[PDB]
Amino acid sequence: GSSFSGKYQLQSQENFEAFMKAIGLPEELIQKGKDIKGVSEIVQNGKHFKFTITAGSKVIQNEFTVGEECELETMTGEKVKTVVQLEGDNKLVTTFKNIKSVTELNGDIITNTMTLGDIVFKRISKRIG
Numbered sequence: 001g002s003s004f005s006g007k008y009q010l011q012s013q014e015n016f017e018a019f020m021k022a023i024g025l026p027e028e029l030i031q032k033g034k035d036i037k038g039v040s041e042i043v044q045n046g047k048h049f050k051f052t053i054t055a056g057s058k059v060i061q062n063e064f065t066v067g068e069e070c071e072l073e074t075m076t077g078e079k080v081k082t083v084v085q086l087e088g089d090n091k092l093v094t095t096f097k098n099i100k101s102v103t104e105l106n107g108d109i110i111t112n113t114m115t116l117g118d119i120v121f122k123r124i125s126k127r128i129g
């Protein structure tokens with residue numbers, strides 16, 4: 001239904017280093033990645049989502065159907081089995097490895113909040129293309 005469809009680039013983020021260290025991202029990628037303004041491409045067709053996250057040379061492709069089991073490839077390379085849900089047209093919610101992820105679209109701005117214990121990793125992206 002394409003509410004989420006589009007290309008978005010990171011503008012700013014909070015707690016990137018603390019989060020990525022916690023989840024087990026190699027430090028050399030943490031250091032090279034902290035100032036990258038990554039691009040996220042989303043194609044939504046009803047309940048069916050495809051998204052590509054590009055940060056440098058690194059490209060992660062994922063897909064899921066809302067309300068069904070999916071297999072998501074995380075930043076470490078670990079693939080996790082989970083379910084992604086919509087809470088209204090503009091909010092995607094999921095959990096994996098004790099991390100709660102909330103992706104919310106407001107016009108042209110996507111806010112993604114990933115919470116692991118006390119660590120709240122927040123990314124703000126802006127529609128490009």
Ligand SMILES: CCCCCCCCCCCCCCCC(=O)O
Nearest residue numbers: 029032033038055056057058112123
């Ligand atoms: C070899 C160059 C280094 C590349 C490593 C850069 C990795 C940066 C990580 C930023 C991507 C974080 C995306 C979190 C998932 C999400 O918010 O939807």
Ligand SMILES: CCCCCCCCCCCCCCCC(=O)O
Nearest residue numbers: 040051073074075092101103112123
């Ligand atoms: C790399 C781990 C995948 C992230 C898990 C959340 C999956 C549901 C949301 C998919 C839309 C992705 C939006 C990206 C926004 C952003 O780059 O911060």
